[PDB]
Design a protein around this ligand. Structure first.
Ligand SMILES: N=C(N)Nc1ccc([C@H](N)P(=O)(O)O)cc1
Ligand SMILES: [Mg+2]
Ligand SMILES: [Mg+2]
Ligand SMILES: [Mg+2]
Ligand SMILES: [Zn+2]
Length: 889
């Protein structure tokens, strides 16, 4: 397969100025006619004209209204149409074509496809060439004039980008609509939608120009009543870009459309954003709480792309992080401001340090701006998105809000209407950096290493205090492990937001301070420090690094109780748990290895248990924060710290630690589970579709976490509570009743009850499937076979397949069964899925990403399954390339 390299970028020898499309959708086929008005560019050197075009059936192709002849004037190999240069004109010309495509059998969900009874396109990154011929790359900017025709009873609602300029009847029960979109765009932002769609709508008035913007949100008829929160989120999103960034929407209308079958969350097609139904629709009756934050976040993210992706555009796909990392940063600032809860930022850190750090230490490690790719569809990674977002957020930390805003506005003013690279962004931030430092010789050149260098830096600390001098020193070191991308890793620009806490009264000892670490090591000295402080390091999680605080557990406890920063408190708790986990893991491992008849375990620190009870008992402390402190760090975070991890020894370690704490605190857990009920489950606003209270949902999260702890512990008579909880009107509660009942004989009675409640709402049924998949059941393999036979069957909906299998892969004991039967099961599912949807088959490989981190038996079992998948004669290019990179072949 062809490898694309960042350093090889060159502009095309052609220009496409205008696209005129006619898309005629019929029962068994869709015919696409396309006229491209083209030119020869200044870069042209007499080359063949080569269009992308994948899976197209050519009826005919032409230049200037004359037909071309296959074999003599052109070849087409199902991937590239080559028109030999001797037949390509040398000034402005028309290329035209008519192709047939088949959205009804398009189960890969890229190009034009049918989702249930809606026809819908997905073009990013390489899907437009599955619809018609094009030079399908984001620097090819063009105007679009698009006509769609279809059966009017089946497809009454026709949408594409721009203004609808004509609507017309067609003989035989058909109708048409023409949409003209004069501003230039790249072809991956084209979209079309056709269906029997119902809508909610509102008018928004922009803050500064006072323009009326019409907002439409669309779904199939059955679910139209689940669109209201999405419309509220869109208003919120427009207001935030106005208030924080001073940015207004430029167009007269914005449409949001929900479809049932979608590979990711959503897509920012200009004026026509299309969503996975699970990221657009919710109701209080038929959705779990998580849906509310998810919709806010995905509606926000697609709205923010209108600037950071749609108006300031990418030169080439190696710059992907400049739109995705920046948009995720904008999305996260917006979510933090709308939810007003500390757990929003904590949940982003949790995601990065579990999933993205695992990627960054795997054979798939890459910088946020990679140097090569083979498959663009595999380039949309947690590294590019979430580490890209932390790199974009570090500019804000370094500059502060006023200078960050000036720099951002510099980037937008200078690049609005044009393509940009990561350097242009760094340049704009630098201008703000010169202004902040008040010195024009200050620069951010070393900052670009965050774009090019792969791997997670490690940052470690030592301290010194002189009581006589009142002088405190923080000695800092940074290191990044060599890997396959850089042999020698250079020191990064690491901003370290710090506080100094007086351990006597818990008070701040210094003003806001951000250390700028720019060297492999540095020593930071503070004078007039009256007492020996406890340092509060990386406040807000100020750089995407492994933090090694070298504090004692006494100091960590003091921070957990007394520090002002939520992330440092949570990270202090995390570090206490990690020290505990690694000690017990090694005691368990030594006993298993030496086949000991008896041995000792190091108990959980008593004063840490006391600090947890102190926080839980505090009526003014935050319930979301409380849920984080009672939960051990995620398995995928823990794995970064253990070689050859034996998943059974880790399961025993976790069991021991949870039982140690619960043995002290279960009575406290019970008492809180009961006292939280009135506020957590309050129904006052259940029928108010727009009233969303993130604090209340965090109270539910806490009650559901405590109930899970009390159920695993078999706390006296807890089943009574479980059964009562199953009667709750909130799906978060009654699905929780299902999974915690796994430890009782009531499990299948609640399985049937909750199925009945879920089965008539497509999305709620998917949440039920996830709840079943994740259930802590000894007969989990037999339960999966049951879901396959009774519910999933041969669904090709990626939301159904993912719901059934992915949560199960997190079952530490059972997915990792030493027979290799869990790895065998998931590899069968990947191979089956790959026949119709390579992109989702690749997603389903995720459990394998850590294969070379496990114990040698399990490494070998996983590698066997991956090699079996690689040997399938019918493997997709996309699955193949990924598994080749993952197995270091
Ligand atoms: N992940 C893919 N292969 N395709 C794909 C689909 C949608 C998008 C959108 N820009 P997103 O960042 O998911 O909002 C980006 C890429
Ligand atoms: Mg085809
Ligand atoms: Mg406002
Ligand atoms: Mg379905
Ligand atoms: Zn995006």
């Amino acid at each position: 397969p062809k490898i694309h390299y960042r350093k090889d970028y060159k502009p095309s020898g052609f220009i496409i100025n205008q696209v005129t499309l006619n898309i005629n959708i019929h029962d068994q086929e869709t015919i696409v006619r396309s006229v491209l008005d083209m030119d020869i560019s200044k870069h042209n050197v007499g080359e063949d004209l080569v269009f992308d075009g994948v899976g197209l059936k050519i009826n005919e192709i032409s230049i200037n209204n004359k037909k071309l002849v296959e074999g003599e004037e052109y070849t087409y190999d199902n991937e590239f149409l080559t028109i030999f240069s001797k037949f390509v004109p040398k000034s402005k010309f028309a290329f035209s074509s008519e192709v047939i495509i088949h959205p009804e059998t398009n189960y890969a969900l890229t190009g034009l496809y049918k989702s249930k009874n809606i026809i819908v396109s997905q073009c990013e990154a390489t899907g437009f060439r599955r619809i018609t011929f094009f030079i399908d790359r984001p620097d090819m900017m063009a105007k679009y004039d698009v006509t769609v025709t279809a059966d009017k009873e089946k497809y009454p609602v026709l949408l594409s980008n721009g203004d609808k300029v004509n609507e017309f009847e067609i003989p035989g029960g058909r109708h048409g609509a023409r949409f003209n979109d004069p501003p230039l765009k790249p072809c991956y932002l084209f979209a079309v939608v056709a269906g029997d769609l119902k809508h909610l709508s509102a008018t928004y008035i922009t803050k500064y120009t006072k323009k009326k913007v019409e907002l439409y949100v669309f779904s199939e008829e059955k679910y139209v009543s689940k669109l209201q929160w999405a419309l509220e989120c869109l208003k919120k999103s427009m207001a935030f870009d106005e208030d924080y960034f001073g940015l207004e929407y430029d167009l007269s209308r914005l449409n949001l459309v929900a479809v049932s079958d979608f590979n990711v969350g959503a897509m920012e097609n200009k004026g026509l954003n299309i969503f996975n139904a699970n990221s657009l629709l919710a109701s209080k009756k038929n959705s779990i709480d998580f849906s509310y934050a998810r919709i806010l976040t995905v509606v926000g993210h697609e709205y923010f792309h209108q600037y950071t992706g749609n108006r300031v555009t990418l030169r080439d796909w190696f710059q992907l992080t400049l739109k995705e990392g920046l948009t995720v940063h904008r999305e996260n600032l917006f979510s933090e401001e709308m939810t007003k809860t500390v757990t929003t930022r904590l949940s982003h850190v949790d995601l990065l340090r579990s999933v993205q750090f695992l990627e960054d230490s795997s054979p798939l490690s890459h910088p946020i701006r990679p140097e090569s790719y083979v498959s663009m569809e595999n380039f949309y990674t947690t590294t590019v998105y979430d580490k890209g977002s932390e790199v974009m957020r570090m500019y804000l930390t370094i500059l502060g809000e006023e200078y960050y805003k000036k720099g951002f506005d510099i980037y937008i003013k200078k690049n609005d209407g044009n393509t940009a690279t990561c350097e242009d962004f760094n340049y704009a931030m630098e201008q703000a950096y010169k202004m902040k430092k008040a010195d024009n010789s200050a620069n951010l050149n070393q900052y670009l290493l965050w774009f090019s260098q792969s791997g997670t830096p490690h940052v470690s600390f030592k301290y010194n205090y002189d009581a006589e001098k009142k002088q405190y020193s923080i000695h800092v070191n940074q290191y990044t492990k060599p890997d396959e991308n850089q042999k020698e890793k250079k020191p990064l620009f690491i901003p370290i937001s710090v506080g100094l806490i007086n351990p006597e009264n818990g008070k701040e000892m210094i003003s806001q301070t951000t250390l700028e670490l720019t060297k492999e090591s540095d020593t930071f000295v503070f004078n007039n420090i009256a007492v020996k402080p406890i340092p509060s390091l990386f406040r807000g999680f100020s750089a995407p690094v492994y933090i090694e605080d070298q504090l004692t557990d006494e100091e960590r406890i003091l921070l957990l109780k007394y520090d002002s920063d939520a992330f440092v408190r949570y990270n202090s708790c995390t570090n206490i748990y990690m020290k505990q986990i690694l000690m017990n893991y090694n005691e368990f491992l030594k006993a298993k290895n030496e086949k000991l008849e008896s041995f000792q375990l190091t108990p959980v620190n008593a004063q840490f248990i006391d600090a947890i009870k102190y926080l839980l008992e505090d009526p003014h402390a935050d319930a979301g924060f409380k849920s984080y402190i009672v939960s051990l760090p995620q398995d995928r975070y823990i794995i970064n710290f253990v070689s050859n991890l034996d998943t059974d020894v880790l399961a025993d370690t976790k069991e021991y630690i949870y039982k140690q704490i619960g043995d002290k605190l279960n009575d406290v857990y019970y008492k809180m589970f009961k006292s939280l009920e009135a506020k957590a489950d309050d129904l006052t606003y259940f029928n108010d579709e727009s009233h969303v209270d993130f604090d209340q949902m965090n109270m539910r999260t806490l009650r559901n976490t405590l109930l899970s702890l009390l159920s695993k512990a078999q706390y006296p008579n807890i089943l009574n509570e479980i059964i009562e909880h199953s009667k709750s009107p909130y799906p978060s509660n009654w699905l929780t009743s299902l999974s915690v009942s796994a430890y009782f004989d009531k499990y299948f009675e609640l399985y049937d009850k909750t199925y009945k409640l879920s089965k008539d709402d497509e999305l709620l049924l998917q949440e039920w499937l996830k709840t079943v998949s994740r259930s802590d059941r000894k007969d989990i393999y037999e339960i999966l076979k049951k879901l396959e036979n009774e519910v999933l069957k041969d669904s090709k909906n990626p939301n159904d397949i993912r719901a059934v299998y992915l949560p199960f892969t997190n079952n530490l004991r059972r997915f990792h069964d030493i027979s290799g039967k869990g790895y065998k099961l998931i590899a069968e599912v990947i191979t089956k899925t790959d026949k119709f949807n390579p992109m989702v088959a690749t997603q389903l490989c995720e459990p394998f990403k850590l294969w070379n981190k496990l114990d040698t038996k399990r490494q070998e079992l996983m590698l066997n399954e991956m090699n079996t998948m690689l040997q399938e004669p019918q493997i997709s290019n996309n699955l193949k390339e990924y598994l080749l990179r993952l197995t270091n072949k």
